[PDB]
Symmetry: none
Amino acid sequence: SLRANDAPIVLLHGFTGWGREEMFGFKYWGGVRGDIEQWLNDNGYRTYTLAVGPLSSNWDRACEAYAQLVGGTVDYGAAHAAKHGHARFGRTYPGLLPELKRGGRIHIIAHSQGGQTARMLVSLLENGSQEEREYAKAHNVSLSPLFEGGHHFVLSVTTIATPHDGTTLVNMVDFTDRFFDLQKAVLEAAAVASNVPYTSEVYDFKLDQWGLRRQPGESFDHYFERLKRSPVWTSTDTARYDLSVSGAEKLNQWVQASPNTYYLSFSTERTYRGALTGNHYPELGMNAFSAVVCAPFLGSYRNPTLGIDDRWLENDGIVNTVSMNGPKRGSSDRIVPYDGTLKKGVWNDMGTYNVDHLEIIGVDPNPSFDIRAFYLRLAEQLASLRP
Amino acid sequence: SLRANDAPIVLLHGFTGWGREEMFGFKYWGGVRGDIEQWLNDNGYRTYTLAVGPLSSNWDRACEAYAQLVGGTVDYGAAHAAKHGHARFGRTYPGLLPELKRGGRIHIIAHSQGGQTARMLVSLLENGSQEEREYAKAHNVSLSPLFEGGHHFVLSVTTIATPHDGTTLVNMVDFTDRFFDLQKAVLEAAAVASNVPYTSEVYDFKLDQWGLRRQPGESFDHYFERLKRSPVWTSTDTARYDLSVSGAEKLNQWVQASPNTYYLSFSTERTYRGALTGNHYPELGMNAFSAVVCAPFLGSYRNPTLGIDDRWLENDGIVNTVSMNGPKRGSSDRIVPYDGTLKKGVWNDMGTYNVDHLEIIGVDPNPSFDIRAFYLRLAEQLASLRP
Ligand SMILES: [Ca+2]
Ligand SMILES: [Ca+2]
Ligand SMILES: [Cl-]
Ligand SMILES: [Cl-]
Ligand SMILES: [Cl-]
Ligand SMILES: [Cl-]
Ligand SMILES: [Cl-]
Ligand SMILES: [Cl-]
Ligand SMILES: [Cl-]
Ligand SMILES: [Cl-]
Ligand SMILES: [Cl-]
Ligand SMILES: [Cl-]
Ligand code: NA
Ligand code: NA
Ligand code: NA
Ligand code: NA
Ligand code: NA
Ligand code: NA
Ligand code: NA
Ligand code: NA
Ligand code: NA
Ligand SMILES: [Zn+2]
Ligand SMILES: [Zn+2]
């Protein structure tokens, strides 16, 4: 295809994820398979990576993403920060693309919960926040340009394995403990132990707004026990809340597709349907943590009152596949199957791949999945988009 | 734990609550989770339910509980009735347990302000009322046995989420309108509308003494506007007066622990401490009415001169947690942390549970709280008490 835009690609992780220099250089985007950002740069697709709080709400992460792109000090909004009891200002960044203040566009490619954060960033850029604007006028405080509206610079959002209607994993009985055991399993993929008191930071959870940081001498085991009891686990201003079916529906009520952005979704599944009742079971080769800890639950949990039924049981080890083609619960967004022409302002469902939640970013091996081709094909499609 | 007594359990609601035939059978004790009295009976713990005026004083409610238990016409006392301007006599009941007049006893399990009513019932059984005794002699009128003193039929009182020292919620500026909105939120949890003039009674406020009742053609919205302007909201002979920190301390000056009764308290909390100034905020999953309307105030209102300081900020969405382990303000009662042996004549503090004020009775969902095991374990402990 012909190139029709010059927008760089920006990569955005989910409820785990870390910058290029973290985790001893093991990349979230490529894991044991390599460095996806480097593959794209090397093939002429200019690509950058964002690293935002993995456990923070999509709102917090969107404010962090905005400052990382345009430069400046993260501003969560005076109204938001007062309502949830955390700092209004966060870190200060130079900016990856401070030109976006003047003009120019990006493509966001986001995995897992990054797809919620990317959708939310577009809604804030284009429409701002009326609550923040009214609060700033009422209290005579400053207002970040993010909350003004009028700053739409995202040509496309592509989501990969995103829980747009949530994941039923949040409902599992031991979910608090098992979710932090999933963080430990991702550390272990990077050869990072959870019982070692690392002096270097290794994996920064970016919880400056809550005042939390792993302390000198503290193992990840000990630190996650503190995080389980902290506001980033127990408040509604969290990844945990937005990950749930309840909280993803609430997000979908206000975060709509912009008519100025192409949305693409990729769905993932790594399960088979059983012969007894319709439940789903992990396939050979699914990442071991998901296969043992998460997929049996995801493939069997129903909630008839919420209509969480047999269609929700197929999963990729972490998220129910039905959740991933676009927001539907609480959403008026349109979802169309890809027909060869990518359309603005709707979700173009690019299909369902037999790859698990961690294999699709290369964190878990899968030699039958040609991960480099997958990301290069996608970059060629995004470069074809007509602004 | 081996059973040591055969006393039945009697359940007692707070400033909302209704009998088993009210609310089209949606139970206060169990709500959306089921029927706690039925669970208890089906496991061999004989259990009954009281229904007294939700908005009436603890004194009125204790006279009503007395009559419902032993049988007969509610008698509020000639001196009390003349002092406050209401009828001396209320409804007539058949009596759930007339064997209490021949030696039978009960365990009361009480929620919310029910714990103040249960303590007041025990105080009146033990000591009566010298004012009533004086007045009956002076005016040559009859006297209820409740006011004589020298009676005993309560083996134990267990309080759950009770404001023994009051709740600061009453100091909210628009408390009147938000308290009746709480009543409407509880009706909505029971799938009852507030703008429909139901011909059946549905929720009887048992205001016979005040001469108030919902009229034909009157919705709950219109009825609650009248109640707000009526003596059951504007006088001192009300749940409103006894709910406040001021009124709870006045109650504690005369309602003391009996040496012949075990007292157990359960405390509840559903908040996190923020990172700005140590205020408390509602956790994810708190009932929506409390989370929006009540918890932000409860977690941020301080009054150092009245001793309302950091200890009062943690709360369950309706009552400050520090108020719930037993009466302290204006009280000489002893409170001891449970140590595996329950003690008579003192408050056995059974701990604090991460469950909100409505979750603890099942009116609001919380799948992580095993409400059936909670009540069954409590009934087994009460059955183990030595008589
Ligand atoms: Ca694999
Ligand atoms: Ca709840
Ligand atoms: Cl180190
Ligand atoms: Cl810390
Ligand atoms: Cl950290
Ligand atoms: Cl099956
Ligand atoms: Cl591989
Ligand atoms: Cl007994
Ligand atoms: Cl008694
Ligand atoms: Cl009337
Ligand atoms: Cl705070
Ligand atoms: Cl539940
Ligand atoms: Na505040
Ligand atoms: Na840290
Ligand atoms: Na499959
Ligand atoms: Na298949
Ligand atoms: Na929809
Ligand atoms: Na109904
Ligand atoms: Na808490
Ligand atoms: Na005291
Ligand atoms: Na819990
Ligand atoms: Zn926030
Ligand atoms: Zn009265």
